[PDB]
């Protein structure tokens, strides 16, 4: 019917590859790989990708390609008792569009400020830097006070963030203007890129998702020439077979592969809903998983050879400088590293452009997925003015993200990252996989997969669809639900009330699923057996 397909198959492939990659393949994978096992981390990562990420990825991709509906309108034809998946996914996408875009705003501010022969973090001879200055080493004579900070750390904590004026999480300090202008610009770009649909989203992804790879290759070629750039490569490739015995390494690998491939979310499904019918969605899923793994691998290479160059110029044992867990690894350490190299300006520009284009495509994909979901759900009041209500959802994300644009917004973005995403999306994906496999029927799903492309998958894919991925997801949820994380940021410890607030925001999306199972039987009442058999049966087109 009116299914607006892509220009070419390579267009959808590039769009989904862009949705796959993000900052999390640069700031998270190398750090987690170094912490959990070192060089030997590749084995559990690849195992949990083969068993945990690729199966759910391909399952939801083929499901959305077959049924041709959004992540909310598909439950009418899959399992009407679980229509709250769409609403929970919209809530999670709102939380992400709120917190994640602040990283893009910071990167854009860094970019627009880096247009100077003297980088703003190569010397602290500025107004914001205080007497606690200790410039880059350049020698080993200088001693370091316990409170002494590098010029890039000072620039990141006082000027681009303005976090020194945060006297407590109970208040915010005030919304800054520079970060607000950068986020206004980036949201305007998002709105002018996702207004029409996949037709122009695919045209902008052609330069949005391909630009990170050329910058990554340039940075890798640079890292292949830096002095002492082999120490970091050796730390990245030094295996530790003893660390693999621990279960925390496997938990970290599973969490990383899940939040890198992003399976069972509702963007792959919304994209495949616009894909062709007889298209080979198996090869696409395979090549996307492979290219995401290879992108994470190359990003680990480049990041750790940069840290190795730093540990050669500075003191070695990169773990001494790689203490910041989060985006600070790209904002503090990498800034120092680029500042020490000659002609730092060009490399700063290309690196921050790589960050901003790694964020752009991911935000495009998420917002396009949620927009396609809400459009497929209400195609009468909406879908007549598609370019409308997109400005409305953009202003909604802006109003949700203004709380992160304050002076102490780093605490807010960390709280939203580590609490508003994990358990909610994991339980959502788990019960979605149960609905598609157990409730909807694994045999029926395999029959639809066979009829769609022309051949049914093997018994191994069925095992991964019915038992392996469910146990994987439930293992992750029971691991994350049994260890309340006392996370901190810049020595700002989070009290227990912050943990309660994070837990409340976390469940603020899952409860929408019981909402529908509660307020759906009010129109189809009756006995218990008739209701339990009417909730499971799908729609009859």
């Amino acid at each position: 019917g009116e299914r607006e397909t892509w220009g070419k198959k390579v267009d959808f492939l590039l769009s989904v590859i862009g949705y796959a990659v993000d900052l999390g393949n640069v700031w998270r994978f190398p750090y987690i790989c170094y912490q959990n096992g070192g060089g030997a981390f590749l084995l559990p990562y690849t195992i949990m990708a083969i068993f945990g990420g690729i199966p759910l990825f391909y399952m939801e991709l083929a499901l959305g390609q077959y049924h041709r509906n959004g992540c909310i309108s598909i439950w009418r034809k899959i399992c009407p008792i679980f229509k709250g998946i769409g609403y929970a996914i919209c809530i999670i996408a709102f939380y992400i569009a709120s917190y994640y875009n602040t990283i893009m705003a910071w990167a854009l501010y860094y970019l627009i400020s880096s247009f100077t022969d003297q980088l703003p973090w190569t010397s602290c001879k500025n107004s914001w830097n205080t007497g606690n200055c200790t410039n880059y080493f350049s020698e080993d004579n200088i001693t370091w006070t316990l409170h002494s900070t590098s010029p890039a750390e000072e620039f990141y904590t006082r000027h681009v963030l303005q976090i020194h004026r945060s006297k407590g999480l109970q208040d915010l300090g005030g919304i800054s203007w520079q970060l607000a202008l950068c986020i206004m610009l980036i949201f305007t770009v998002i709105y002018f890129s996702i207004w029409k649909g996949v037709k122009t989203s695919g045209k902008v992804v052609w330069v949005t998702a391909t630009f990170p790879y050329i910058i990554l290759s340039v940075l890798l070629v640079r890292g292949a020439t830096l002095p002492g750039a082999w120490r970091g490569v050796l730390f990245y490739l030094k295996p530790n077979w003893q660390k693999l015995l621990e279960t925390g390494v496997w938990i970290d690998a599973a969490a990383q592969i899940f939040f890198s491939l992003g399976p069972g979310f509702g963007v792959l499904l919304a994209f495949a809903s616009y894909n062709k019918f007889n298209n080979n969605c198996y090869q696409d899923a395979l090549v996307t998983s492979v290219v995401n793994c290879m992108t994470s691998f190359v990003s680990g290479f480049v990041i750790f050879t940069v840290l190795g160059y730093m540990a050669e110029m500075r003191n070695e044992d990169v773990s001494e400088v790689a203490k910041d867990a989060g985006p600070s690894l790209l904002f503090i350490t990498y800034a120092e590293a680029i500042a020490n190299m000659p002609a730092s300006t060009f490399f700063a520009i290309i690196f921050f452009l790589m960050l901003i284009t790694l964020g752009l495509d991911s935000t495009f994909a998420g917002l396009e997925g949620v927009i396609t979901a809400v459009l497929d759900e209400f195609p009468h009041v909406w879908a007549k003015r598609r370019e409308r209500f997109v400005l409305a959802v953009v202003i909604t994300c802006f109003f949700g993200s203004l709380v992160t644009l304050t002076f102490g917004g780093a605490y807010v973005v960390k709280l939203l990252e580590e609490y508003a995403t994990g358990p909610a999306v994991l339980t959502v994906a788990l019960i979605e996989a149960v609905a598609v496999s157990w409730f909807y029927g694994i045999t029926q799903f395999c029959r639809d997969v066979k009829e769609m492309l022309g051949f049914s998958p093997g018994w191994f894919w069925r095992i991964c669809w019915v038992a392996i991925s469910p146990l994987f997801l439930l293992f992750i949820i029971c691991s994350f639900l049994m260890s309340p994380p006392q996370l901190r940021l810049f020595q700002y410890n989070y009290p227990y009330w912050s943990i309660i607030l994070g837990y409340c925001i976390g469940t603020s999306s899952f409860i929408c699923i019981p909402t529908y199972i509660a307020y759906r039987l009010i129109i189809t009442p009756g006995t218990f057996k008739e209701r339990i058999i009417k909730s499971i049966t799908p729609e009859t087109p």
Epitope: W144, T145, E316
Partner: antibody, heavy 117, light 106 residues
């Protein structure tokens, strides 16, 4: 000019425990790491662990994971390290010393007390 | 761990000669090596850190160099008050560790 006080020796019986203090006099208490290090009778030095006086953080050795635990107090200007599971092989002189952040050299040491069994 | 191996615990010479000791590292260490002086009975005394920079309160007699794995701690014209068990400590990685040292004869 800068002295590092310490506790006194004690004939500790096998099974009991003992803690040793330290006083950073001459330089500020909360601007450099207060490391601890051990050496047996006529043997080599063995690092015990690191402590952060500003936030009470610590980073102990892998040979003293549960064997030793350290605490600090910037109000009383002390460094209380707790030693448990004492024996004869682990009973010798201990040292308290200062160290800045990431040149990691031990500038000034205490007078040195021996925890003999 | 990163074991700190040095010369023999007795390799030394008489008074007024060129004393040179080495400190081999299991892992390649660029400059993260220090040198402490253990006078008989007392605490170790820091002399040189980063393998090429003598800490304050030092006579010009103490010297030292080296990089990668072998660090050359050289000193000539030794006096009667500079004979002590010189330990070799590294700044490389946690858990940090010291060396063995060497007695001075004669």
């Amino acid at each position: 000019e800068v002295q590092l006080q310490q506790s006194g020796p004690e004939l500790v019986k096998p099974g009991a425990s003992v803690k040793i203090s330290c006083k950073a006099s001459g330089y500020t208490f909360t601007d450099y790491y207060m490391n601890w290090v051990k050496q047996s009778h006529g043997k080599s030095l063995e690092w015990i662990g690191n402590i952060n006086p500003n936030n009470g953080g610590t980073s102990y050795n892998q040979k003293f994971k549960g064997k030793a635990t350290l605490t600090v107090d910037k109000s009383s200007t002390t460094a209380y390290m707790e030693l448990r599971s004492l024996t004869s092989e682990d009973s010798a002189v201990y040292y308290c010393t200062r160290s800045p952040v990431r040149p990691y050299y031990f500038d000034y040491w205490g007078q040195g007390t021996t925890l003999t069994v | 761990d990163i074991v700190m191996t040095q010369s023999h615990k007795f390799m030394s010479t008489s008074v007024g000669d060129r004393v040179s000791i080495t400190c081999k590292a299991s892992q390649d260490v660029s400059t993260a090596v220090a040198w402490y002086q253990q006078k008989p009975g007392q605490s170790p005394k820091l002399l040189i850190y980063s393998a090429s920079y003598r800490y304050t309160g030092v006579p010009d007699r103490f010297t030292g160099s080296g990089s990668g794995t072998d660090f050359t701690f050289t000193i000539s014209s030794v006096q009667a008050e500079d004979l002590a068990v010189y330990y070799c400590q590294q700044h490389y990685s946690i858990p940090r560790t010291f060396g063995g040292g060497t007695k001075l004869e004669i």
